[PDB]
Write a protein that binds this ligand. Sequence first.
Ligand code: SF4
Ligand code: NA
Length: 214
Amino acid sequence: MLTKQQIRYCLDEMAKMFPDAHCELVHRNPFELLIAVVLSAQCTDALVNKVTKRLFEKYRTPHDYIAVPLEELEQDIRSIGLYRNKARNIQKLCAMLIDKYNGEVPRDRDELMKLPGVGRKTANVVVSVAFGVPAIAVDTHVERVSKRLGFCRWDDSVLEVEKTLMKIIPKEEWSITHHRMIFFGRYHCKAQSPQCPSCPLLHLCREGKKRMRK
DNA sequence: AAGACGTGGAC
DNA sequence: GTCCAGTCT
Ligand code: SF4
Ligand code: NA
């Protein structure tokens, strides 16, 4: 695995490559963000944004989601995929906000995780983007980039990846580094077509050198 | 704990 | 016709 100094070097470069990295999910408030991120699991941002475009016009509060039959909401988000479980989780999540959190999105990460459909990744995105709380959400891109570069071991859990980054990066930079890593993986270190040949980190990447040799 | 969930887009 | 875009039971 890379040394701390090297990992910081990698992150510094990603910042130069994607200085404008940000959350690409369209939302106007914390509630819309929460729904959007829940829908985002195993789905592309493009499709989530196309769907919420109309979804957020039809539904604006947790009462709107629980007022329609489950079958109706399922159709409204059908294009997202995993729509049966997500629609059910959303209705249960909205009922919980009303019953347990005074009808508002809680600002605590562990409290958010009590909502159905919300795991650690979802909760971290919400507290970070909506409430400015430092956190590192580890998704497919962050995990892949971390393992290819050697930030951690290939067998590490996503929690392990998260803890490794939290110890190497100043809390004040957690949120932006997370976004920079996501952009790096989404647009450069892609799952199917990584841009190794022109990568500024090729000189220290175990995965890159392994691919170039082939 | 492995396995189900799932449509849409990129090759 | 594969492969890629987290959470729950
Ligand atoms: S060398 Fe390739 S595998 Fe390594 S980080 Fe750059 S694009 Fe990703
Ligand atoms: Na949860």
